[PDB]
Design a protein around this motif. Structure first.
Motif, PDB file in Angstrom:
ATOM      1  N   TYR A  92       0.876  -1.249   0.082  1.00  0.00           N
ATOM      2  CA  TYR A  92      -0.095  -0.154  -0.039  1.00  0.00           C
ATOM      3  C   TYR A  92       0.949   1.182  -0.055  1.00  0.00           C
ATOM      4  CZ  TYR A  92      -3.637  -3.463   0.970  1.00  0.00           C
ATOM      5  OH  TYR A  92      -4.375  -4.482   1.158  1.00  0.00           O
ATOM      6  N   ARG A  93       0.502   2.152  -0.886  1.00  0.00           N
ATOM      7  CA  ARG A  93       1.186   3.601  -1.042  1.00  0.00           C
ATOM      8  C   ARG A  93       0.234   4.330  -0.757  1.00  0.00           C
ATOM      9  NH1 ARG A  93       3.523   6.613  -6.466  1.00  0.00           N
ATOM     10  NH2 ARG A  93       4.823   8.117  -5.059  1.00  0.00           N
ATOM     11  N   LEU A  94       0.287   5.060   0.649  1.00  0.00           N
ATOM     12  CA  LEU A  94      -0.779   6.138   1.193  1.00  0.00           C
ATOM     13  C   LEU A  94      -0.281   7.442   0.634  1.00  0.00           C
ATOM     14  CD1 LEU A  94      -1.423   3.352   2.587  1.00  0.00           C
ATOM     15  CD2 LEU A  94      -1.353   4.978   4.843  1.00  0.00           C
ATOM     16  N   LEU A  95      -1.270   8.032  -0.141  1.00  0.00           N
ATOM     17  CA  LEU A  95      -0.709   9.301  -0.664  1.00  0.00           C
ATOM     18  C   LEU A  95      -1.802  10.472  -0.273  1.00  0.00           C
ATOM     19  CD1 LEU A  95      -0.544   7.935  -4.054  1.00  0.00           C
ATOM     20  CD2 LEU A  95       1.517   8.838  -2.813  1.00  0.00           C
ATOM     21  N   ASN A  96      -1.279  11.720  -0.524  1.00  0.00           N
ATOM     22  CA  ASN A  96      -2.158  12.703  -0.199  1.00  0.00           C
ATOM     23  C   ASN A  96      -3.268  13.218  -1.428  1.00  0.00           C
ATOM     24  OD1 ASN A  96      -1.327  13.439   2.480  1.00  0.00           O
ATOM     25  ND2 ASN A  96       0.644  13.931   1.527  1.00  0.00           N
ATOM     26  N   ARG A 119       2.796   5.867 -14.369  1.00  0.00           N
ATOM     27  CA  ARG A 119       4.161   5.399 -13.933  1.00  0.00           C
ATOM     28  C   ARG A 119       4.730   6.297 -12.834  1.00  0.00           C
ATOM     29  NH1 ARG A 119       7.995   2.833 -16.350  1.00  0.00           N
ATOM     30  NH2 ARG A 119      10.025   2.844 -16.403  1.00  0.00           N
ATOM     31  N   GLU A 120       5.412   5.772 -11.912  1.00  0.00           N
ATOM     32  CA  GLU A 120       6.107   6.531 -10.937  1.00  0.00           C
ATOM     33  C   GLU A 120       7.322   6.817 -11.311  1.00  0.00           C
ATOM     34  OE1 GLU A 120       4.914   8.449  -8.418  1.00  0.00           O
ATOM     35  OE2 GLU A 120       6.980   9.059  -8.455  1.00  0.00           O
ATOM     36  N   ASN A 121       7.855   8.101 -11.527  1.00  0.00           N
ATOM     37  CA  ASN A 121       9.037   8.164 -11.769  1.00  0.00           C
ATOM     38  C   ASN A 121       9.994   8.227 -10.558  1.00  0.00           C
ATOM     39  OD1 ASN A 121       9.145   8.863 -14.681  1.00  0.00           O
ATOM     40  ND2 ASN A 121       8.102  10.543 -14.551  1.00  0.00           N
ATOM     41  N   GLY A 122       9.899   8.614  -9.385  1.00  0.00           N
ATOM     42  CA  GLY A 122      10.578   8.478  -8.326  1.00  0.00           C
ATOM     43  C   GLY A 122      10.620   7.040  -7.909  1.00  0.00           C
ATOM     44  N   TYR A 123      11.211   6.552  -6.830  1.00  0.00           N
ATOM     45  CA  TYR A 123      11.017   5.191  -6.214  1.00  0.00           C
ATOM     46  C   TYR A 123       9.706   5.209  -5.770  1.00  0.00           C
ATOM     47  CZ  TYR A 123      16.067   4.870  -6.980  1.00  0.00           C
ATOM     48  OH  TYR A 123      17.196   4.762  -7.933  1.00  0.00           O
ATOM     49  N   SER A 124       9.107   4.028  -5.603  1.00  0.00           N
ATOM     50  CA  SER A 124       7.728   4.014  -4.886  1.00  0.00           C
ATOM     51  C   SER A 124       7.801   3.513  -3.340  1.00  0.00           C
ATOM     52  CB  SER A 124       6.761   3.191  -5.508  1.00  0.00           C
ATOM     53  OG  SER A 124       6.542   3.818  -7.005  1.00  0.00           O
ATOM     54  N   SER A 125       7.769   4.177  -2.399  1.00  0.00           N
ATOM     55  CA  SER A 125       7.567   3.864  -1.121  1.00  0.00           C
ATOM     56  C   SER A 125       6.394   3.431  -0.498  1.00  0.00           C
ATOM     57  CB  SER A 125       8.038   5.095   0.122  1.00  0.00           C
ATOM     58  OG  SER A 125       8.237   4.738   1.288  1.00  0.00           O
ATOM     59  N   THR A 126       6.259   2.016  -0.139  1.00  0.00           N
ATOM     60  CA  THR A 126       5.001   1.379   0.331  1.00  0.00           C
ATOM     61  C   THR A 126       5.063   0.771   1.422  1.00  0.00           C
ATOM     62  OG1 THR A 126       5.476  -0.679  -1.044  1.00  0.00           O
ATOM     63  CG2 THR A 126       4.291   1.040  -2.213  1.00  0.00           C
ATOM     64  N   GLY A 134      -1.628   1.141   6.770  1.00  0.00           N
ATOM     65  CA  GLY A 134      -1.730   1.949   7.952  1.00  0.00           C
ATOM     66  C   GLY A 134      -0.609   1.863   8.930  1.00  0.00           C
ATOM     67  N   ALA A 135       0.445   0.902   8.427  1.00  0.00           N
ATOM     68  CA  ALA A 135       1.517   0.811   9.422  1.00  0.00           C
ATOM     69  C   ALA A 135       2.032   2.050   9.479  1.00  0.00           C
ATOM     70  CB  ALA A 135       2.686  -0.204   8.893  1.00  0.00           C
ATOM     71  N   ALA A 136       1.768   3.073   8.552  1.00  0.00           N
ATOM     72  CA  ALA A 136       2.516   4.415   8.420  1.00  0.00           C
ATOM     73  C   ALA A 136       1.853   5.513   7.625  1.00  0.00           C
ATOM     74  CB  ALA A 136       3.833   4.264   7.660  1.00  0.00           C
ATOM     75  N   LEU A 137       1.800   6.452   8.086  1.00  0.00           N
ATOM     76  CA  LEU A 137       1.124   7.783   7.465  1.00  0.00           C
ATOM     77  C   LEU A 137      -0.582   7.324   7.126  1.00  0.00           C
ATOM     78  CD1 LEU A 137       3.812   7.370   6.550  1.00  0.00           C
ATOM     79  CD2 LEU A 137       3.482   8.937   4.653  1.00  0.00           C
ATOM     80  N   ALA A 138      -1.127   6.418   8.036  1.00  0.00           N
ATOM     81  CA  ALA A 138      -2.313   5.960   7.879  1.00  0.00           C
ATOM     82  C   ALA A 138      -3.435   6.942   8.119  1.00  0.00           C
ATOM     83  CB  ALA A 138      -2.600   4.983   9.261  1.00  0.00           C
ATOM     84  N   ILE A 148      -5.914   9.113   0.286  1.00  0.00           N
ATOM     85  CA  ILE A 148      -5.515   7.959  -0.858  1.00  0.00           C
ATOM     86  C   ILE A 148      -4.741   6.952  -0.528  1.00  0.00           C
ATOM     87  CG2 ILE A 148      -4.860   7.549  -3.075  1.00  0.00           C
ATOM     88  CD1 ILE A 148      -5.466  10.471  -3.696  1.00  0.00           C
ATOM     89  N   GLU A 149      -5.273   5.632  -0.752  1.00  0.00           N
ATOM     90  CA  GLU A 149      -4.599   4.366  -0.585  1.00  0.00           C
ATOM     91  C   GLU A 149      -4.474   3.806  -2.053  1.00  0.00           C
ATOM     92  OE1 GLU A 149      -5.628   1.771   2.504  1.00  0.00           O
ATOM     93  OE2 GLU A 149      -5.927   0.162   1.107  1.00  0.00           O
ATOM     94  N   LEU A 150      -3.081   3.879  -2.372  1.00  0.00           N
ATOM     95  CA  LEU A 150      -2.940   3.007  -3.887  1.00  0.00           C
ATOM     96  C   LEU A 150      -2.583   1.543  -3.647  1.00  0.00           C
ATOM     97  CD1 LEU A 150      -0.118   4.300  -6.218  1.00  0.00           C
ATOM     98  CD2 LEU A 150      -1.820   2.508  -6.465  1.00  0.00           C
ATOM     99  N   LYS A 151      -3.679   0.763  -3.756  1.00  0.00           N
ATOM    100  CA  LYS A 151      -3.203  -0.669  -3.248  1.00  0.00           C
ATOM    101  C   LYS A 151      -2.802  -1.351  -4.820  1.00  0.00           C
ATOM    102  CE  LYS A 151      -6.410  -4.820  -2.246  1.00  0.00           C
ATOM    103  NZ  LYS A 151      -7.589  -5.324  -1.732  1.00  0.00           N
ATOM    104  N   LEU A 152      -1.690  -1.559  -4.810  1.00  0.00           N
ATOM    105  CA  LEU A 152      -0.786  -2.153  -5.733  1.00  0.00           C
ATOM    106  C   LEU A 152      -0.467  -3.776  -5.687  1.00  0.00           C
ATOM    107  CD1 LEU A 152       1.861   0.379  -6.047  1.00  0.00           C
ATOM    108  CD2 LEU A 152       0.175   0.002  -7.656  1.00  0.00           C
ATOM    109  N   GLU A 153      -0.900  -4.462  -6.661  1.00  0.00           N
ATOM    110  CA  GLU A 153      -0.845  -6.091  -6.603  1.00  0.00           C
ATOM    111  C   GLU A 153       0.550  -6.285  -7.375  1.00  0.00           C
ATOM    112  OE1 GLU A 153      -2.696 -10.440  -7.446  1.00  0.00           O
ATOM    113  OE2 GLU A 153      -3.769  -8.509  -8.388  1.00  0.00           O
TER     114      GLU A 153
END
Ligand SMILES: NC(=O)c1ccc[n+]([C@@H]2O[C@H](COP(=O)([O-])OP(=O)(O)OC[C@H]3O[C@@H](n4cnc5c(N)ncnc54)[C@H](O)[C@@H]3O)[C@@H](O)[C@H]2O)c1
Length: 212
Positions: free
Chosen positions: A84-88, A132-139, A144-148, A152-157
């Motif tokens: 999960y990539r939590l975003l603003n 496409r995320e040009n930077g690295y993707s911090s997930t 919820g383990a972080a910035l819960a 937005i919650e980008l749920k990536l399989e």
């Protein structure tokens, strides 16, 4: 075996440690990961400013990027899995068709809950599209383990065998406890849907990552 989706921190840690062990990180690997988690703006901002084109970056940054690219590629997922990539909401400024006013209205929640109509518009605007995320993707392995608190919650399989670094270990990250899984820069993902969370307090963007 079927796709993993962690809700228990202990199970996630156990699974993540296996990636760490398979990685066989050197001191150079540990330094790259740690420094990124502590101060990543010097790297991802310039990467985002020039797409995934490392050749437009200063020499010091190109070296660090090639290094981190190499470190991340040292381990791959042993199972298909969701991260999960939590975003603003600022993330949505990058979506074609969603107007400045749609966002203005979107921020106006009803006791935290987001407008279903605007979320449906997002679904319409993003479904079946490859981003496409040009930077690295911090997930995070566990949502919820972080910035819960983020909207937005980008749920990536993640497909089995795709490059990914599990870094939730005291020597790898400046922020332990976020069950962080760092994905390669240039990660591509096809959006399956955009819907409201079960409690309508978050916008869930579900997508499938292309094996890297
Ligand atoms: N975000 C997470 O889920 C997560 C999980 C692992 C650890 N943490 C830690 O959080 C710190 C920073 O993480 P972060 O997620 O804020 O970093 P980030 O690089 O994603 O920050 C960019 C910010 O701009 C927005 N954004 C992201 N991608 C965008 C794009 N392509 N276009 C337009 N806007 C975009 C987001 O709302 C985000 O807050 C790191 O130290 C990391 O280790 C975060």
């Amino acid at each position: 075996a079927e796709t993993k989706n962690f809700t228990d921190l202990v199970e996630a840690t156990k699974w993540g440690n296996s990636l760490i062990k398979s990685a066989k990180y050197s001191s150079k690997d540990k330094m790259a990961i740690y420094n990124y988690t502590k101060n990543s703006s010097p790297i991802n901002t310039p990467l985002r400013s020039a797409n995934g084109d490392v050749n437009k970056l200063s020499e010091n940054i190109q070296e660090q990027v090639r290094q981190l690219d190499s470190t991340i590629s040292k381990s791959v997922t042993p199972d298909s899995v969701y991260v999960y990539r939590l975003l603003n909401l600022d993330y949505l400024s990058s979506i074609t068709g969603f107007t400045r006013e749609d966002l203005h209205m979107l921020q106006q929640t009803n006791n935290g809950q987001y407008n279903e109509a605007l979320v449906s518009k997002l679904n319409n605007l993003m479904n079946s599209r490859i981003y496409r995320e040009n930077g690295y993707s911090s997930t995070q392995l566990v949502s919820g383990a972080a910035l819960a608190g983020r909207p937005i919650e980008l749920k990536l399989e993640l497909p089995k065998g795709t490059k990914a670094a599990y870094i939730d270990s005291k020597e790898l990250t400046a922020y332990p406890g976020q069950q962080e899984v760092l994905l390669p820069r240039g990660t591509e993902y096809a959006v399956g849907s955009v819907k409201l969370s079960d409690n309508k307090r978050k916008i869930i963007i579900t997508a499938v990552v292309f094996k890297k």
